[PDB]
Each structure stands twice: as structure tokens, then as C-alpha cells.
Design a protein around this ligand. Sequence first.
Ligand SMILES: *[C@@H]1O[C@H](CO)[C@@H](O)[C@H](O)[C@H]1NC(C)=O
Lengths: 49, 50
Amino acid sequence: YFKIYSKHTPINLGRDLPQGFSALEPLVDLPIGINITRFQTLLALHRSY
Amino acid sequence: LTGTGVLTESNKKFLPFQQFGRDIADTTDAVRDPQTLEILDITPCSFGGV
Ligand SMILES: *[C@@H]1O[C@H](CO)[C@@H](O)[C@H](O)[C@H]1NC(C)=O
């Protein structure tokens, strides 16, 4: 189960990772047997910002 | 989840992902109806010494 505990927090970012407490609710718990041992994000947007 | 209790309406709010609902113990103080997705309020039947 690839759990994705996502909280799209509707708060401001006066500063990054601000203080306070924000619990994360799982959104998708993907059942898949896989060995992730790396990672990378994408900005593939054509008009990459 | 098999047990004995007094099923009743619950004012508790089970966040979407929240299936069952124990309390400060281990007792399923609440269940979400498989169907109708309703938050019940399972409570033990009124026993007591005589
Ligand atoms: C998954 O990949 C890593 C990196 O190659 C490897 O060390 C690991 O043994 C793999 N996991 C499994 C399923 O054996």
C-alpha cells in the first residue's frame, strides 16, 4: 500500500514550513508491490515555469 | 466487527477515511454502516448487578 497522506493546507506562507500543527489525512493508499529506492519531482509543463 | 450493543445515532463526525471508531480503551465505541455510510454509536447493553 503506497499511502499518500495529503493535506492541502489552506493557510498562508508568510514563511516556509510555518509553525503550528497540521494533521495530514490519507488521500490514496495505492496497493502495489514495488521497491521505491529513489525519487524525483517533475515540472514538465512545456512552458516549464 | 461482531459484538453486542445498543446501536444508536451518533453525532460524531467520521472523516471520510475513518472506518471504525474505538475510544480511550479498545471498544469500537462507533461503526460506519457498511451501507448508508452512517456513523452509529455502538454502546454496551445496560447490564448491572442485582
Ligand atoms: C528494490 O531495489 C533495490 C535497489 O536496487 C534493491 O536493493 C532491493 O533489494 C529491491 N527490493 C526487492 C523487492 O528485493
